[PDB]
Design a protein around this ligand. Structure first.
Ligand SMILES: NC(=O)C1=CN([C@@H]2O[C@H](COP(=O)(O)OP(=O)(O)OC[C@H]3O[C@@H](n4cnc5c(N)ncnc54)[C@H](O)[C@@H]3O)[C@@H](O)[C@H]2O)C=CC1
Ligand SMILES: NC(=O)C1=CN([C@@H]2O[C@H](COP(=O)(O)OP(=O)(O)OC[C@H]3O[C@@H](n4cnc5c(N)ncnc54)[C@H](O)[C@@H]3O)[C@@H](O)[C@H]2O)C=CC1
Ligand SMILES: NC(=O)C1=CN([C@@H]2O[C@H](COP(=O)(O)OP(=O)(O)OC[C@H]3O[C@@H](n4cnc5c(N)ncnc54)[C@H](O)[C@@H]3O)[C@@H](O)[C@H]2O)C=CC1
Ligand SMILES: NC(=O)C1=CN([C@@H]2O[C@H](COP(=O)(O)OP(=O)(O)OC[C@H]3O[C@@H](n4cnc5c(N)ncnc54)[C@H](O)[C@@H]3O)[C@@H](O)[C@H]2O)C=CC1
Lengths: 302, 302, 302, 302
């Protein structure tokens, strides 16, 4: 079986462990710096193997060397711009341990701001560029897809959409790349099934969804976890899904030496393909704004 | 639980019963005119409830009144243009029994030529237009999607495509409506990841797939069954999937008083939406050719 | 689709909503008395329909009349013996609203001490005895089954076991009723694959598991949620699983007028069968101790 | 991904390929000696990746060297006692190719009489004893479990039962080892929920089920396929299920140098445990009769 190490056993970590057992995806280590909490979560979660018909070990850890043997490492560890150097130090520490203990693992970074943190961990861990990605577009687009599906009264997964550049407030929502059952969304607009003004409000809701959830006295963690597991599952099972993730750009969109959100194909070799959308000049200008903000924050991270 | 009656317990019927138990979708009746064969298939299939963790009854029947209580009726019963009046007589007979025993059932017609047979059964059963559809586009597009996915090395379901008008040799393969991970296929052509000539060969392979399978000394029945169950499941579970099926046209594409293939939304109310693609004049001319052939065959069916 | 109302949107409520969407079981209402928190959790969870390929609405509520239309109601609402009258008052309030708004719903009670609270809600809601059960044995036995499976290196679900009488410290762990792959556990003891002393330590661990998790700075909520969803799913899908739950006793084990834990069969009619284990006199004496403690606490609840 | 080679692409082979794609278990090769038929079945089945959300290659083969790289090999190839030397010759041929091309594969033998054929293939292939098993008990017990579940109105999987010794007419149906929800069946008999006479009729039905299906003008192949896939899945996913299979006996039950049916644990190391039921002297005498018949037939196979 695969060994999946969750570096960070907080809110997202707990849901990931739950879903991994539900899906029987592999053995799980809940790693954290907080003493014994991961052992407690692991114990609770382990019992769900019975209900789920699964056979995944779930263990807790406070010991970095339990990274040894990991096939997948998912980094949610962390805790304004003031946090950037603190979370950088966490990425440095984790990277040194990945390099030593599991240099061949597939790495998914979640810690915000993710497009910065994923590149910092790439640098500190030394893993190949096809073996480390960041969460962003699967989550952001799940929101956009879902909101459109409820307006159009269709199955949520039948809406497809692209959000690129970065996770966070500069995300680029590409109206031209929305489809419903594979059909351009513009046909539905033309038929007055959804209006341009409705879509503008949905776009703004998508950008502000994390804030909306926080203002309702909750935290966004279940959908982030589910998005991460969709990514990890595509790797583990060699599904070769097209999923939008933060990945190293090497000239796509006119950008290099930086990570940003774009469709990729995830399978057994990691990032098997980086797909470059054929953006028009106006869309590219928005992409550039997203990259500029990643670069601004990266400079502050040290 | 739902009661699903398979009117026709041949090759497609057997796989449908298998998949219904796998998915725990409902109780199954394998109905046929052949004596005892459906009882034998039902007995074999019923044991798979243990392996599948399901609880679906599977029974055989030679008695039409076992249609009573059906929530879903799937018609594969049947056996050149010479067959048209013989299969019409089968649709007449089945329709009379549906009208009497299960007028509120959701009906899926499979018997070829499906766009003719579905309308004949609509007429003979009296069910509402939102409660009867024919298999076509889910199956035809599964082939197109699959062949493209193997060229592009992506997950099969991540290719979406539209084939409309009719099932059979006049099916309309809409190049403009192919996407990969929600991205227009033309971007992949522009990047020389797949060529126009490759796609032409894939289109011809799609049209001729049933013949290809027969020439390899096999029969097309597993994918037809899986396509039908995808449709039935969307109804039973109120998924509201966008699925291309044969449905009554009431002016879409300039056509009325005939069934043809188009995207529809399938949920608990049956056909909840008929989606009309905004075809251009050249695509519409191909659609017209498909309808004309359905009409030609319908006239021969009596 | 089914409508599932989670009366209580805390830790267990959140995981239940997650699992319901994963399993596409029905629309979900997260109801709570805390303002807006359920709306926030509902919003986060709703996005997972995309990742899960599901179509379940997830809404929050602070309005009791949203119980109207519920097919299943799961009660986790609540917050030593000092709490008994406070949680009784919560059961009274919920019961009045169930009686008015959804008297035909299937009710699962979770609030501790569950064997007391389930009967109080039965009394206050007026629902039939086959339509209300309490969580206990599925959860307690998941722990016992799991711990044994890890010693014997077998699939967790292949261990079966019975814990009866009550949830909590007087639970009756029935050594005679443990099997592995359907084989009596005693054969494995005879073969020195597990010893009697190992099993004694596992029994004590099972009884004290909730305390163990709390002492590790965690809370038991994921496995409780999964156990509840196994119960709810058996009802919704008419699986007729044998599951140990708290149910009204009408003479079984020599007890009436009280709820206690025993195997039941859960299907579309609710509790379709109450199974009475043929306990020996010594096992019965332990059962009596469990009932006595439920009665002691019920008297304090008012 | 795993590579699963189906040596034999007939009735059972076709269903296995269908189920492997449904479960996304691995790439599939349909191998047969019949020209092109496996290619045709493979082509049909491959399209179901779209409906199933899977990514399994399905190919046909007439070339034995396509065994190279196989992780799992499932042998259904074959076609009274007169057939024994003909099917032996098929096992010899297959064994030579396994030894050359995939000596590290996990092998499941199905060809009848399975307890003879599995040992012949063990001998001819040279694989280790923990890496080759025969289908029998999962299938025979699925029938027994199912029939009892329908009498008792419980979920089929909640009945557990043991049938040992051999597949075929000398199978040993162990009344003492039947449970319902983990409870001895005798408690249900004592409660007059099922009688001893009913169980005798169910036992006879179980022994004669293949004949019953054939006499109904059908063939037993769907449940055999599902049983085989349950076994293969337990290996591939390291589930460590307890499953009754034909395996090499090394003194269990007083028998050596022969294969017979007994519970085993199947996981990533193949047969991880052989479980010896603690049979009484009368049960052992029936076990001996089953082994004697395997030995009689093996002698005739050459
Ligand atoms: N990329 C995206 O789309 C999203 C990113 N996020 C980010 O994900 C991160 C995690 O979010 P939650 O799980 O909700 O937070 P959380 O606060 O519940 O969990 C973070 C955990 O990291 C642990 N931690 C701190 N230093 C560590 C170290 N060196 N090694 C291991 N563990 C360590 C903490 O003790 C804590 O348990 C945050 O940075 C958040 O902003 C959240 C949602 C979406
Ligand atoms: N719409 C589509 O995309 C496709 C349609 N088809 C069509 O589906 C149909 C079924 O195909 P298979 O299952 O492979 O054929 P099959 O020949 O195996 O099964 C047809 C069954 O219908 C039964 N039957 C005849 N009259 C009947 C009656 N009055 N009531 C009930 N059963 C009756 C037969 O005895 C036979 O068992 C054929 O018409 C075939 O051309 C096949 C593949 C795809
Ligand atoms: N039966 C069993 O096996 C188990 C029972 N439990 C019990 O389950 C209950 C819930 O546990 P958690 O979810 O972890 O607790 P929690 O404290 O996270 O959630 C309880 C929720 O109930 C809400 N609430 C209070 N009064 C309410 C009302 N009138 N209507 C609706 N909501 C109301 C609270 O605001 C809170 O959000 C507790 O009583 C706990 O002891 C926990 C585990 C196992
Ligand atoms: N162990 C058990 O519980 C059960 C065993 N069986 C046995 O399973 C076997 C298969 O049954 P079905 O699939 O229904 O039969 P089938 O006749 O449909 O398929 C057998 C296939 O083996 C092929 N074959 C013959 N020689 C071959 C070779 N050297 N290499 C590869 N393929 C070759 C044939 O061409 C045919 O396609 C039979 O021996 C049957 O008695 C069937 C049911 C249960």
């Amino acid at each position: 079986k695969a060994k999946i190490v969750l570096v960070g056993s907080g809110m997202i970590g707990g849901v990931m462990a739950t879903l991994i057992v539900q899906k029987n995806l592999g053995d799980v280590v809940l790693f954290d710096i907080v003493k014994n909490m991961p052992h407690g979560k692991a114990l609770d979660t382990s019992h769900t193997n019975v209900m789920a018909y699964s056979n995944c070990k779930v263990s807790g850890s406070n010991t970095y060397d339990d990274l040894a043997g990991a096939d997948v490492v998912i980094v949610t560890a962390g805790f304004r711009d003031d946090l950037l150097p603190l979370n950088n130090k966490i990425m440095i520490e984790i990277g040194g341990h990945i390099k030593k203990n599991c240099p061949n693992a597939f790495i998914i970074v979640v810690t915000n701001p993710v497009d910065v943190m994923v590149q910092l961990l790439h640098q500190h861990s030394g893993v190949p560029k096809n073996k480390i990605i960041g969460l962003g577009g699967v989550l952001d687009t799940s929101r956009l897809k879902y909101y459109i599906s409820q307006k159009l009264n269709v199955c949520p997964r039948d809406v497809n959409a692209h959000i690129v550049g970065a996770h966070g407030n500069k995300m680029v929502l590409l109206k031209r790349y929305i489809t419903v059952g594979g059909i351009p969304l513009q046909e539905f607009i033309n038929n007055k099934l959804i209006s341009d003004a409705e879509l503008e409000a949905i776009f703004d809701r998508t950008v502000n969804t994390a804030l909306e959830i926080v203002n309702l006295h909750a935290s966004p963690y279940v959908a982030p976890a589910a998005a991460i597991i969709e990514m990890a599952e595509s790797y583990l099972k060699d599904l070769k899904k097209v999923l939008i993730c933060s990945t190293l750009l090497e000239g796509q969109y006119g950008h290099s030496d930086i990570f940003g959100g774009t469709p990729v194909v995830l399978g057994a070799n990691g990032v098997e393909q980086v797909i470059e959308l054929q953006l028009n000049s106006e869309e590219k200008a928005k992409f550039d704004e997203a990259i500029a903000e990643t670069k601004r924050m990266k400079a502050l991270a040290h």
